[PDB]
């Protein structure tokens, strides 16, 4: 009817207002602001340790707080927890559902998370037992596949699902406290800002939304990507974040200008992006591609900081330790590689 | 100390050995078109999974389904739900990460189709072109059945599915169409014969033989 018509007209007017407001705040560009800085040059990183022992393709990974232990999720149905320094196993968790699309490590180092094409977030506690791994709580309130999950401190966990909605979960009560609605496609990746107060979420609608944990309403929407966003990571400062996409691009979005600050792409790249993550100082943006490698991009100069070779299959997960000592990447070749 | 960590890692790897044995023994299968189903046939593990509990957005959870032996694609031979199955099959065949997966195509609801085609209810010729220019193939097995009109349409849908299969997928793709709708318990057997050929053709290529 005509009611939807003038409502869409008002929405278009508001979009034009947001666009011209963004344009009015574009006095400079990251390229010329950074131009005077010394180029980082070629950075060489070599495989320190290869972590073998998984069966199927590894889909997600997450470092621990102490930069010692990482958890790996594979579609074989395992949640093997690694020890990077001495390349052994700490725990091996068999999953009720064979397909897992995400895993999280609690900052307290007491709980682990998984989830996938089962619409349930399973929480496994690694401390209270006499030595075992048991499902402490199963969070079933999602109508789509879980794509990413992150603990807040020890009891609140935010989950991104294919149900077009994110959600905040209270583990102890096993209830969905707040829901995050407003996306259009399936939500793939969410990144928590340091000193957790608000988180981002990039979905298949080529848009990343910034959500407030307490308020529950998204603050700003960043629509600059051509295609689906497969990964997103917060810049260490907390006023910026970088988003991967299937458009063969990584774009750094600032929080205080609501704009894309720099485009990280090359004409020799056609494949999409699987996972992105910043370094300790935010100088290097590491990005895993479908070109079988994990290109390293300088976060200010938009230049190839160094080509990072590796797995014989597609990389899907890529993470950096909190102390920034090493970078761990996991691929579909059932292998985790540690680089420094 | 390090001794305890080494012992724990050794025990975990020992368990992972049996896990590898079971995982290699079990063959996974996707049911697409219409959550878990394990069935035993000739003493080999088989695992069926239907993922109908997710939304119609299919492009990004199907990326997670590429180690399966085959994708079993069931269609209704009766909106035009036929081309929707055709377009879905095109996406499966041509996908980058599904490029090494064979399809065990099942043309279900043949009896519903057969009851439909006995009069001009919804003419396929007026619904799909190049029907009046298509006849039953010589290398066919119509068998004793209904009016030879239905088997002409019966084989036309299979032929159209196959033109997609033979247009790409040099050696990692093979389509295995079947004509089945009635519950007779040999359908699962038809899957066993299909999955045997999939692994057999996989090994023939892997040894640079086929």
């Amino acid at each position: 009817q005509s009611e939807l018509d003038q409502l869409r007209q008002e929405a278009e007017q508001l979009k034009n207002q947001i666009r011209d407001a963004r344009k009015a705040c574009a006095d400079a560009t990251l390229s010329q602001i950074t131009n005077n800085i010394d180029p980082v040059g070629r950075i060489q990183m070599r495989t320190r340790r290869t972590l073998r022992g998984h069966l199927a393709k590894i889909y997600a990974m997450h470092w621990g707080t102490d930069s010692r232990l990482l958890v790996s999720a594979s579609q074989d149905g395992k949640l093997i927890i690694w020890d990077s320094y001495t390349t052994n196993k700490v725990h091996a968790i068999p999953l009720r559902s064979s397909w897992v699309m995400t895993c999280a490590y609690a900052p307290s180092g007491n709980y682990v998370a998984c989830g996938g094409l089962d619409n349930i977030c399973s929480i496994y506690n690694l401390k209270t037992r006499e030595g075992n791994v048991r499902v402490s709580r199963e969070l079933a309130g999602h109508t789509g596949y879980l794509s990413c999950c992150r603990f807040l401190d020890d009891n609140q966990i935010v989950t991104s699902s294919g149900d077009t909605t994110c959600a905040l979960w209270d583990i102890e009560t096993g209830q969905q406290t707040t829901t995050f609605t407003g996306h259009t496609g399936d939500v793939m990746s969410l990144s928590l800002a340091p000193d957790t107060r608000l988180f981002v979420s990039g979905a298949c609608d080529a848009s990343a939304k910034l959500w407030d944990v307490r308020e529950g309403m998204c603050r700003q929407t960043f629509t600059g990507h051509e295609s689906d966003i497969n990964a997103i990571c917060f810049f260490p400062n907390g006023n910026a974040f970088a988003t991967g996409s299937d458009d063969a691009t990584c774009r750094l979005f600032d929080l205080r200008a609501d704009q894309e600050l720099m485009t990280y792409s090359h004409d020799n790249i056609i494949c999409g992006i699987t996972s992105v993550s910043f370094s300790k100082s935010g100088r290097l943006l590491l990005a895993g591609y479908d070109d079988f490698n994990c290109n390293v991009w300088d976060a200010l100069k938009a230049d190839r900081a160094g080509v990072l070779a590796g797995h014989d299959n597609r990389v899907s997960c890529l993470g950096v330790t909190d102390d920034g000592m090493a970078v761990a990447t996991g691929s579909w070749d059932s292998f985790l590689k540690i680089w420094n | 100390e390090e001794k305890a960590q080494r012992e724990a890692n050794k025990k975990i790897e020992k368990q992972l050995q049996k896990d590898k044995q079971v995982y290699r023994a079990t063959h996974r299968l996707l049911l697409l078109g219409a959550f878990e189903t394990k069935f035993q046939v000739d003493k080999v593990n088989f695992h069926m999974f239907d993922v109908g509990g997710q939304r119609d957005e299919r492009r990004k959870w199907i990326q997670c389904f590429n180690d399966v032996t085959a994708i079993i694609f069931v269609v209704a031979s009766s909106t035009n739900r036929l081309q929707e199955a055709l377009n879905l099959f095109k996406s499966i065949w041509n996908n980058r990460w599904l490029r090494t997966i064979s399809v065990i195509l099942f043309l279900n609801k043949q009896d519903l189709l057969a009851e439909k085609v006995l009069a001009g209810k919804s003419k396929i010729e007026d619904y799909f072109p190049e029907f009046a220019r298509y006849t039953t193939p010589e290398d066919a097995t119509p068998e004793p059945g209904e009016d030879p009109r239905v088997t002409r349409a019966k084989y036309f849908i299979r032929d159209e599915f196959l033109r997609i299969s033979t247009a790409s997928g040099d050696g990692r793709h093979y389509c295995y169409p079947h004509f089945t709708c009635a519950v007779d318990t040999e359908n699962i057997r038809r899957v066993f014969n299909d999955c045997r050929d999939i692994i057999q053709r996989m090994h023939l290529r892997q040894y640079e033989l086929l």
């Epitope: 077009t164 259009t184 496609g185 298949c204 609608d205 080529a206 848009s207 629509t223 051509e226 295609s227 689906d228 299937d246 458009d247 063969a248 056609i270 999409g272 | 939304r55 119609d56 957005e57 299919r58 492009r59 199907i62 929707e84 377009n87 095109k90 996406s91 499966i92 065949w93 041509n94 996908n95 980058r96």
Partner: nanobody
């Protein structure tokens, strides 16, 4: 954004000719396969036709083959698909939609809404 504004349509007597033009913005046109999806009242979304990046690989729905033709102008970032000899059964809300991934030969587009890479469409009615 990825806005895809569609034009044309309206009320056309059966057997006539009518043209749709869909404008593309926010993405590189040459990198994406594009296709039209229609939705008759009550009925669900049905794929009409698709065209490759270079305009070579072109296919149509059987019910519309021989009547509709699809062509794209990469320089102008517009997609055209023509009516010829319209029938009362083709009244629908035609949409212009984009393949989700760039430089890909497979698409998963037709969905019960919740698909961002598709415009709001233009209503076409053939009643006379």
């Amino acid at each position: 954004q990825v806005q895809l504004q569609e034009s044309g349509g309206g009320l056309v007597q059966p057997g006539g000719s009518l043209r749709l033009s869909c404008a593309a913005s926010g993405f590189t046109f040459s990198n994406y396969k594009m296709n039209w999806v229609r939705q008759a009242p009550g009925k669900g979304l049905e794929w009409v036709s698709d065209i490759s990046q270079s305009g070579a690989s072109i296919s149509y729905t059987g019910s519309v083959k021989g009547r509709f033709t699809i062509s794209r102008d990469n320089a102008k970032n517009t997609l055209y698909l023509q009516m010829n000899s319209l029938k009362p059964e083709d009244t629908a809300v035609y949409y212009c939609a984009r393949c989700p991934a760039p430089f890909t030969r497979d698409c998963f587009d037709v969905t019960s809404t919740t698909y961002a890479y598709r415009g709001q469409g233009t209503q076409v009615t053939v009643s006379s």
